[PDB]
């Protein structure tokens, strides 16, 4: 109806290691979050649970200000996230984004 709520996937500047610890405890593949990278100041990183590991994707931004990971460009971070709920977040393996439980 669209109730204005902060995005549940944003955790700010949590370490890459701390993101892995959290996501390794999740039950489903695809459980994710977006954090502000420590190693690369100014870049956001998308962290995702995948079996017994956690994969990280750099969130890129072009000159027109659109967000992307691969080829398809997005007008917002939430549109990027939603798209990757039905299309794989990876061109290598089939991984669909799903919200973190609890």
């Amino acid at each position: 109806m669209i109730e204005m709520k902060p995005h549940p996937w944003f955790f700010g500047k949590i370490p890459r290691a701390k993101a892995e610890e959290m996501l390794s405890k999740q039950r489903h593949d695809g459980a994710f979050l977006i954090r502000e990278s420590e190693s690369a100041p100014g870049d956001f990183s998308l962290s995702v649970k995948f079996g017994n590991d956690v994969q990280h994707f750099k969130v890129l931004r072009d000159g027109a200000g659109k967000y992307f990971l691969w080829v398809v460009k997005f007008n917002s971070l939430n549109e990027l996230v939603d798209y990757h709920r039905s299309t794989s977040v990876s061109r290598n393996q089939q991984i669909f984004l799903r919200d973190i439980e609890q």
Partner: peptide, 5 residues
């Protein structure tokens, strides 16, 4: 990272 070196 998966998408960039």
């Amino acid at each position: 990272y998966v998408n960039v070196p």
